[PDB]
Design an enzyme around this catalytic site. Structure first.
Site, PDB file in Angstrom:
ATOM      1  N   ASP A  56      -5.482  -1.035   6.627  1.00  0.00           N
ATOM      2  CA  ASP A  56      -5.945   0.039   5.758  1.00  0.00           C
ATOM      3  C   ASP A  56      -7.244  -0.326   5.026  1.00  0.00           C
ATOM      4  OD1 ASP A  56      -4.828  -1.442   3.471  1.00  0.00           O
ATOM      5  OD2 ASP A  56      -2.904  -0.343   3.745  1.00  0.00           O
ATOM      6  N   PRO A 107       2.346   5.333   3.822  1.00  0.00           N
ATOM      7  CA  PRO A 107       3.743   5.019   4.084  1.00  0.00           C
ATOM      8  C   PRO A 107       3.928   3.777   4.963  1.00  0.00           C
ATOM      9  CG  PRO A 107       3.059   6.852   5.409  1.00  0.00           C
ATOM     10  CD  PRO A 107       1.891   6.530   4.542  1.00  0.00           C
ATOM     11  N   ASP A 108       5.010   3.047   4.713  1.00  0.00           N
ATOM     12  CA  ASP A 108       5.414   1.952   5.568  1.00  0.00           C
ATOM     13  C   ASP A 108       6.234   2.552   6.710  1.00  0.00           C
ATOM     14  OD1 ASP A 108       7.867   2.463   4.393  1.00  0.00           O
ATOM     15  OD2 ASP A 108       8.037   0.546   3.376  1.00  0.00           O
ATOM     16  N   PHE A 109       6.949   1.706   7.465  1.00  0.00           N
ATOM     17  CA  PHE A 109       7.846   2.185   8.509  1.00  0.00           C
ATOM     18  C   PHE A 109       9.284   2.256   8.000  1.00  0.00           C
ATOM     19  CE2 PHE A 109       5.047   0.464  12.258  1.00  0.00           C
ATOM     20  CZ  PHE A 109       4.133   1.471  12.041  1.00  0.00           C
ATOM     21  N   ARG A 110       9.763   1.190   7.354  1.00  0.00           N
ATOM     22  CA  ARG A 110      11.194   0.979   7.234  1.00  0.00           C
ATOM     23  C   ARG A 110      11.817   1.723   6.055  1.00  0.00           C
ATOM     24  NH1 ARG A 110      12.286  -1.667  11.482  1.00  0.00           N
ATOM     25  NH2 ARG A 110      11.119  -3.488  12.184  1.00  0.00           N
ATOM     26  N   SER A 113       0.827  -1.201   0.000  1.00  0.00           N
ATOM     27  CA  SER A 113       0.000   0.000   0.000  1.00  0.00           C
ATOM     28  C   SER A 113       0.869   1.263   0.000  1.00  0.00           C
ATOM     29  CB  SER A 113      -0.984   0.011   1.156  1.00  0.00           C
ATOM     30  OG  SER A 113      -1.633  -1.242   1.350  1.00  0.00           O
ATOM     31  N   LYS A 162      11.072  -4.819  -2.221  1.00  0.00           N
ATOM     32  CA  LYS A 162      12.207  -4.006  -2.640  1.00  0.00           C
ATOM     33  C   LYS A 162      13.530  -4.574  -2.123  1.00  0.00           C
ATOM     34  CE  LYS A 162       9.679   0.174  -3.022  1.00  0.00           C
ATOM     35  NZ  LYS A 162       9.458   1.623  -2.995  1.00  0.00           N
ATOM     36  N   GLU A 163      13.482  -5.382  -1.046  1.00  0.00           N
ATOM     37  CA  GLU A 163      14.672  -5.961  -0.429  1.00  0.00           C
ATOM     38  C   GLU A 163      14.394  -7.416  -0.054  1.00  0.00           C
ATOM     39  OE1 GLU A 163      14.976  -3.390   3.239  1.00  0.00           O
ATOM     40  OE2 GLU A 163      13.348  -4.631   4.074  1.00  0.00           O
ATOM     41  N   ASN A 178      -1.655  -5.236   7.380  1.00  0.00           N
ATOM     42  CA  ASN A 178      -2.149  -3.896   7.108  1.00  0.00           C
ATOM     43  C   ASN A 178      -3.523  -3.664   7.720  1.00  0.00           C
ATOM     44  OD1 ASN A 178       0.171  -3.345   5.705  1.00  0.00           O
ATOM     45  ND2 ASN A 178      -0.740  -3.773   3.690  1.00  0.00           N
ATOM     46  N   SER A 230       8.754  -6.669   5.657  1.00  0.00           N
ATOM     47  CA  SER A 230      10.120  -6.814   6.132  1.00  0.00           C
ATOM     48  C   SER A 230      10.267  -8.104   6.943  1.00  0.00           C
ATOM     49  CB  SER A 230      10.515  -5.601   6.944  1.00  0.00           C
ATOM     50  OG  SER A 230       9.658  -5.438   8.067  1.00  0.00           O
ATOM     51  N   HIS A 277      -3.348  -7.700  12.246  1.00  0.00           N
ATOM     52  CA  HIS A 277      -3.130  -6.539  13.099  1.00  0.00           C
ATOM     53  C   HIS A 277      -4.422  -5.721  13.195  1.00  0.00           C
ATOM     54  CE1 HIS A 277       1.557  -6.902  12.485  1.00  0.00           C
ATOM     55  NE2 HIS A 277       1.069  -7.836  13.265  1.00  0.00           N
ATOM     56  N   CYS A 331     -17.791   7.295  22.590  1.00  0.00           N
ATOM     57  CA  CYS A 331     -18.940   6.437  22.356  1.00  0.00           C
ATOM     58  C   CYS A 331     -20.177   7.210  22.794  1.00  0.00           C
ATOM     59  CB  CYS A 331     -18.736   5.098  23.068  1.00  0.00           C
ATOM     60  SG  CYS A 331     -20.221   4.077  23.266  1.00  0.00           S
TER      61      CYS A 331
HETATM   62  N1  LIG Z   1      -0.411   0.052   5.487  1.00  0.00           N
HETATM   63  C1  LIG Z   1      -0.442  -0.223   6.787  1.00  0.00           C
HETATM   64  O1  LIG Z   1      -1.418  -0.776   7.323  1.00  0.00           O
HETATM   65  C2  LIG Z   1       0.817  -0.032   7.570  1.00  0.00           C
HETATM   66  C3  LIG Z   1       1.760   0.936   7.267  1.00  0.00           C
HETATM   67  C4  LIG Z   1       2.913   1.026   8.027  1.00  0.00           C
HETATM   68  C5  LIG Z   1       3.103   0.182   9.104  1.00  0.00           C
HETATM   69  N2  LIG Z   1       2.168  -0.777   9.401  1.00  0.00           N
HETATM   70  C6  LIG Z   1       2.326  -1.673  10.560  1.00  0.00           C
HETATM   71  O2  LIG Z   1       3.673  -1.693  11.010  1.00  0.00           O
HETATM   72  C7  LIG Z   1       4.241  -2.987  10.738  1.00  0.00           C
HETATM   73  C8  LIG Z   1       4.999  -2.872   9.443  1.00  0.00           C
HETATM   74  O3  LIG Z   1       5.399  -4.170   8.982  1.00  0.00           O
HETATM   75  P1  LIG Z   1       5.792  -4.291   7.438  1.00  0.00           P
HETATM   76  O4  LIG Z   1       6.875  -5.298   7.329  1.00  0.00           O
HETATM   77  O5  LIG Z   1       4.551  -4.361   6.634  1.00  0.00           O
HETATM   78  O6  LIG Z   1       6.333  -2.848   7.093  1.00  0.00           O
HETATM   79  P2  LIG Z   1       7.863  -2.482   7.183  1.00  0.00           P
HETATM   80  O7  LIG Z   1       8.099  -1.036   6.859  1.00  0.00           O
HETATM   81  O8  LIG Z   1       8.334  -3.017   8.493  1.00  0.00           O
HETATM   82  O9  LIG Z   1       8.348  -3.415   5.968  1.00  0.00           O
HETATM   83  C9  LIG Z   1       8.038  -2.956   4.621  1.00  0.00           C
HETATM   84  C10 LIG Z   1       8.806  -3.741   3.583  1.00  0.00           C
HETATM   85  O10 LIG Z   1       8.216  -3.507   2.273  1.00  0.00           O
HETATM   86  C11 LIG Z   1       9.178  -2.954   1.398  1.00  0.00           C
HETATM   87  N3  LIG Z   1       8.473  -2.053   0.503  1.00  0.00           N
HETATM   88  C12 LIG Z   1       7.867  -0.856   0.783  1.00  0.00           C
HETATM   89  N4  LIG Z   1       7.221  -0.342  -0.235  1.00  0.00           N
HETATM   90  C13 LIG Z   1       7.398  -1.271  -1.240  1.00  0.00           C
HETATM   91  C14 LIG Z   1       6.931  -1.329  -2.563  1.00  0.00           C
HETATM   92  N5  LIG Z   1       6.189  -0.382  -3.129  1.00  0.00           N
HETATM   93  N6  LIG Z   1       7.266  -2.420  -3.288  1.00  0.00           N
HETATM   94  C15 LIG Z   1       8.008  -3.376  -2.714  1.00  0.00           C
HETATM   95  N7  LIG Z   1       8.488  -3.440  -1.478  1.00  0.00           N
HETATM   96  C16 LIG Z   1       8.148  -2.340  -0.792  1.00  0.00           C
HETATM   97  C17 LIG Z   1      10.227  -2.318   2.288  1.00  0.00           C
HETATM   98  O11 LIG Z   1      11.404  -2.156   1.528  1.00  0.00           O
HETATM   99  C18 LIG Z   1      10.284  -3.374   3.395  1.00  0.00           C
HETATM  100  O12 LIG Z   1      10.973  -4.543   2.981  1.00  0.00           O
HETATM  101  C19 LIG Z   1       3.042  -3.953  10.768  1.00  0.00           C
HETATM  102  O13 LIG Z   1       2.619  -4.363  12.064  1.00  0.00           O
HETATM  103  C20 LIG Z   1       1.908  -3.099  10.196  1.00  0.00           C
HETATM  104  O14 LIG Z   1       0.656  -3.307  10.829  1.00  0.00           O
HETATM  105  C21 LIG Z   1       1.009  -0.863   8.663  1.00  0.00           C
HETATM  106  C1  LIG Z   2       0.569  -2.254  14.398  1.00  0.00           C
HETATM  107  O1  LIG Z   2       1.277  -2.519  13.405  1.00  0.00           O
HETATM  108  C2  LIG Z   2      -0.016  -0.858  14.465  1.00  0.00           C
HETATM  109  C3  LIG Z   2      -0.552  -0.400  13.142  1.00  0.00           C
HETATM  110  C4  LIG Z   2      -0.425   1.100  12.943  1.00  0.00           C
HETATM  111  C5  LIG Z   2       0.540   1.509  11.867  1.00  0.00           C
HETATM  112  C6  LIG Z   2      -0.122   2.108  10.667  1.00  0.00           C
HETATM  113  C7  LIG Z   2      -0.534   3.540  10.854  1.00  0.00           C
HETATM  114  C8  LIG Z   2      -1.931   3.863  10.366  1.00  0.00           C
HETATM  115  C9  LIG Z   2      -1.983   4.714   9.112  1.00  0.00           C
HETATM  116  C10 LIG Z   2      -3.259   4.561   8.307  1.00  0.00           C
HETATM  117  C11 LIG Z   2      -4.209   5.733   8.366  1.00  0.00           C
HETATM  118  C12 LIG Z   2      -5.662   5.379   8.116  1.00  0.00           C
HETATM  119  C13 LIG Z   2      -5.917   4.332   7.059  1.00  0.00           C
HETATM  120  C14 LIG Z   2      -7.345   3.847   7.026  1.00  0.00           C
HETATM  121 ZN   LIG Z   3     -19.474   2.736  24.733  1.00  0.00          ZN
END
Ligand SMILES: NC(=O)c1ccc[n+]([C@@H]2O[C@H](COP(=O)([O-])OP(=O)(O)OC[C@H]3O[C@@H](n4cnc5c(N)ncnc54)[C@H](O)[C@@H]3O)[C@@H](O)[C@H]2O)c1
Ligand SMILES: *C(=O)CCCCCCCCCCCCC
Ligand SMILES: [Zn+2]
Lengths: 6, 293
Positions: free
Chosen positions: B111, B43-46, B37, B228-229, B109, B204, B128, B162
């Site tokens: 989302d 955005p992701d974290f890493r 996504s 990507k990695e 995710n 990741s 999650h 609520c």
């Molecule tokens: N979309 C979301 O719901 C969201 C977003 C950020 C974090 N998180 C939460 O934080 C934690 C993150 O874990 P994670 O491993 O998914 O995220 P992460 O950032 O820990 O790992 C992301 C991985 O995906 C790769 N990547 C990112 N964009 C890419 C793309 N377009 N194409 C290919 N590879 C790509 C990165 O290089 C990395 O290897 C989870 O618990 C999750 O719930 C959720």
């Molecule tokens: C555990 O991994 C906690 C998950 C929270 C990280 C993602 C942050 C949320 C960003 C999404 C905004 C709203 C999307 C519907």
């Molecule tokens: Zn309530």
């Protein structure tokens, strides 16, 4: 187990 | 059974495409994360540049949410996208379902893009949680609230409360520290007995226990990583004290790595499979429909 970065 | 036999004719995308065309391959599991996504504006974290981690996990720990919920609702306003369009990878998972190849999509995710692309609840283990529904935190109430309501409050910049009991109303995600949903454990119990192909995209594989899901496949289940990695390789140190990814050693037998954008990688796979036109038409028809309404 609970959510954790690890 | 737990034996290491080679089912891909070769450790390539084409190997995987042939394997998917075969009879042995009936039941696919996708594991996905923030990488699928990123191109949808979330955005992701890493990722160095556009990743949340530096543009830090406190804002997703429960004990910090518990104390101060305001910063997270403020972040969610920030990242709440203007429109929800799933990516080529999302719709690739759609085609799988529609061809009856998708056993389950296990997603990190929150989302809802998987549902928007038309994966159903049955198909989906949202490990999650999600922003799709929200609930009251008060155990005696637990009134359920939709995303339309949650959005009104986040964009209004009032902390969601609520309307029955005035407790905090929580989007329904698993924060770090919290236990995963039960349906995750019981689905994994059953799904990894019978998976023929493990497809891993945009993660990741750093968040547990979701990351350990790759070691639950049978040892002869092929595993394809679109990312990507490279990810999910056994660490040289933490391994010192299993079932990690091996794309490269002379003992590689079933793990493939296509390194690049998931949207390109899934588009490549689809083309091998003769689904390319079907993928283009779906994405285009679904995006136009989203643009209309
Ligand atoms: N979309 C979301 O719901 C969201 C977003 C950020 C974090 N998180 C939460 O934080 C934690 C993150 O874990 P994670 O491993 O998914 O995220 P992460 O950032 O820990 O790992 C992301 C991985 O995906 C790769 N990547 C990112 N964009 C890419 C793309 N377009 N194409 C290919 N590879 C790509 C990165 O290089 C990395 O290897 C989870 O618990 C999750 O719930 C959720
Ligand atoms: C555990 O991994 C906690 C998950 C929270 C990280 C993602 C942050 C949320 C960003 C999404 C905004 C709203 C999307 C519907
Ligand atoms: Zn309530």
């Amino acid at each position: 187990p609970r959510k954790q970065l690890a | 059974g737990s034996q290491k036999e080679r089912l891909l004719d070769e450790l390539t995308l084409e190997g995987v495409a042939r394997y998917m065309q075969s009879e042995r391959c009936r039941r696919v599991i996708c594991l996905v994360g923030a990488g699928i996504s990123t191109s949808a504006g979330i955005p992701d974290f890493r990722s160095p540049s556009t990743g949340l981690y530096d543009n830090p996990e406190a804002i997703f720990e429960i004990s910090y949410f518990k104390k101060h919920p305001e910063p997270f609702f403020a972040l969610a306003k920030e990242l709440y996208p203007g429109q929800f369009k799933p990516t080529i990878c999302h719709y690739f998972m759609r085609l799988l379902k529609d061809k009856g190849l998708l056993l389950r999509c296990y997603t990190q995710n929150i989302d809802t893009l998987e549902r928007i692309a038309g994966l159903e609840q049955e198909d989906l283990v949202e490990a999650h949680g999600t922003f799709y529904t929200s609930h009251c935190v008060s155990a005696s109430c637990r009134h359920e609230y939709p995303l339309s309501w949650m959005k009104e409050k986040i964009f209004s910049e009032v902390t969601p409360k609520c309307e029955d009991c005035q407790s905090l109303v929580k989007p329904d995600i698993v924060f770090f520290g919290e236990s995963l949903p039960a349906r995750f454990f019981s689905c994994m119990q059953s799904d990894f007995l019978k998976v023929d192909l493990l497809l891993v995209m945009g993660t990741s594989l750093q968040v547990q226990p979701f990351a350990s899901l790759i070691s639950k496949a049978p040892l002869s289940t092929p595993r394809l990583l679109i990312n990507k990695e490279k990810a999910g390789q056994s660490d040289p140190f933490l391994g010192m004290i299993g079932g990690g990814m091996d794309f490269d050693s002379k003992k590689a037998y079933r793990d493939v790595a296509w390194l690049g954008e998931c949207d390109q990688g899934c588009l490549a796979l689809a083309e091998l499979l003769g689904w390319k036109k079907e993928l283009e038409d779906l994405v285009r028809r679904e995006h136009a429909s989203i643009d209309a309404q």
